[PDB]
Every structure is written in structure tokens, then in C-alpha cells.
Design a binder for this molecule. Structure first.
Ligand SMILES: Cc1cc2nc3c(=O)[nH]c(=O)nc-3n(C[C@H](O)[C@H](O)[C@H](O)COP(=O)(O)O)c2cc1C
Ligand SMILES: Cc1cc2nc3c(=O)[nH]c(=O)nc-3n(C[C@H](O)[C@H](O)[C@H](O)COP(=O)(O)O)c2cc1C
Lengths: 121, 135
């Protein structure tokens, strides 16, 4: 009786798309809790757990770039990206980004939909 | 150690979420979140397996879309879905109790393997409206 995917909402107004909301699937799958992720950028998912301070090299920088262009140009994104759980275990993340236009025909929010796939060592 | 519960900030969820199955006929709902349940007044078990268009009816005992919801917007939505593209717009909906809801709806398709659409995601921002069908 559960969502098939993670949901993430960021604030497109504040600098660098802070997370204002994640759903329970996001929390259960990634091992992070809403409280520790709120206010941060989603790119911590590309670092191998919370004590890796650099993007992991197997994270496809071409896709990360496309994601950046898409957010900046206020358009849709779909792609796939290595991410990692809080415990460092890898995760394939089939990600969809979609902007929300507000009253001013301005982007207020971005929705991320995460269809997580499974593992390897 | 003692576990840490999931979902401590549901009450901070800014929008409804709906997921439909794009493969079954007529986009049946396979999931709705708790903001949807709370705002629309319809609870998950009653809406699963149906098409979202029931929200255009004034409550649960009206079979057809209310004449006040924009037939032009409804049409653009249909087009967008069937054309496998995204949609954003504003639609009159109704809570279970019959009261007007203004639904700022964004629809995005989820392509699977096969570069074929497996799901559509609906994000509902319920905004303010002056629409008021009197007492
Ligand atoms: C709503 C939203 C959800 C996102 N979800 C993810 C995610 O689940 N995994 C991920 O690796 N990046 C995700 N991102 C992307 C990063 O936050 C960031 O935009 C990306 O790493 C490119 O930016 P950068 O080059 O500054 O790192 C998301 C972005 C937004 C706006
Ligand atoms: C994922 C998804 C979510 C939807 N959410 C809503 C909604 O919240 N309110 C609404 O009035 N229609 C919603 N719809 C639209 C209707 O289900 C339907 O597509 C629309 O009325 C146009 O088609 P029709 O003229 O055949 O009814 C949603 C559609 C999809 C695919």
C-alpha cells in the first residue's frame, strides 16, 4: 500500500534547491531521515554515505551535468545515476525532475521522482 | 539502539502526489499520498483503481464532471497524457464533502525500460480560489 518511488520537493527560490520535503520511501530506501536531509541539496546522495566528502567517481558526471542544465533552464529531466544509502551501499536511481510554476509563471519548486533499482559491490 | 521512525515530517508535505499506471487502460490510480487524502477528503482505498477525473464531480454521488470545471483545460490534459508529455494548469476539483478545490496540477510521464511510458505522476498544489457555490 506504498508509493512506488521516492518523492523530493526542493525550493527553487532559495539558492541551491534545498530540500523542503522527502517522502517515506525516500527515507526507507536511502536510509536517511527527513530531519537530516531537510535544507540540504540532494547531491549528498552521490557521496558514499555521510562521511564521504566528494562525489564518487562512478557517479555519471555527464548525467549530473544534464541535470544541472535542466534545473537551470527550467525543464524536465530523466536519467539514471549511481547514488548511495546512508550506509554507503550503492543504489541505481532512475530520476525524473519536473518544475512547478507558481502564480508568477516563475518556478517555485522542483519535484524529483526516484525509481530506485538494485545492487552490486 | 532504538529505531528512528520514518515520516516524522509528513505534516510538511506541500502537495498531493498521485501515481497512475500508464499501461493499464484509462490511467488507473495505483497510489495517492496523505496530503491528497486529507485535502480531497477521499481516502486511498476508495480512489485506487479509478481514474482521477472523479475529482471533477461534485462529491461522490455525482456521476459526471461538474459544469463549472473548465472543459478546455480538461481537454488539454487529455491531449498531454495521450501525447506522453508533461502538463501544468489549474482545474476546479471538489472535496468529498462537495466544496470547491482549486487544483494547480502538474503531470509528468515516467519512461521506463523500452523508452515507453510506465507511469504518470500527478503533483497537486491546492491553491486558493474565490469560487464559491453558495450555501
Ligand atoms: C528536486 C530535486 C531532486 C533531486 N534528486 C536527486 C537525487 O535523488 N540524486 C542525485 O544524485 N541528485 C538529485 N538531484 C540533483 C542535485 O541536487 C544537483 O542538482 C545535481 O547534483 C547537479 O548539480 P551539481 O553539479 O551542483 O552537483 C535532485 C535535484 C532536484 C532539484
Ligand atoms: C497521474 C495523474 C493525476 C491526475 N490528477 C488529477 C487531479 O488531481 N484532478 C483532476 O481533475 N484530474 C486529474 N487527472 C486527470 C484525469 O484523470 C483525466 O486525465 C482528465 O480529466 C482528462 O481526461 P478525460 O477528459 O478523459 O476525463 C490526473 C491524471 C493523471 C494521469
Amino acid at each position: 500500500h506504498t508509493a512506488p518511488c521516492g518523492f523530493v520537493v526542493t525550493d527553487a527560490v532559495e539558492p541551491d534547491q534545498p530540500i523542503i520535503y522527502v517522502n517515506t520511501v525516500f527515507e526507507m530506501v536511502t536510509g536517511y531521515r527527513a530531519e537530516e536531509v531537510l535544507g540540504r541539496n540532494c547531491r549528498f546522495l552521490q557521496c558514499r554515505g555521510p562521511f564521504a566528502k566528494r562525489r564518487h567517481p562512478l557517479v555519471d558526471s555527464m548525467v549530473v551535468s544534464e541535470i544541472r542544465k535542466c534545473i537551470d533552464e527550467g525543464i524536465e529531466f530523466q536519467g539514471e545515476l549511481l547514488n548511495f544509502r546512508k550506509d554507503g551501499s550503492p543504489l541505481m536511481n532512475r530520476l525524473r525532475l519536473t518544475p512547478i510554476y507558481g502564480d508568477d509563471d516563475t518556478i517555485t519548486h522542483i519535484i524529483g521522482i526516484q525509481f530506485f533499482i538494485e545492487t552490486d559491490i
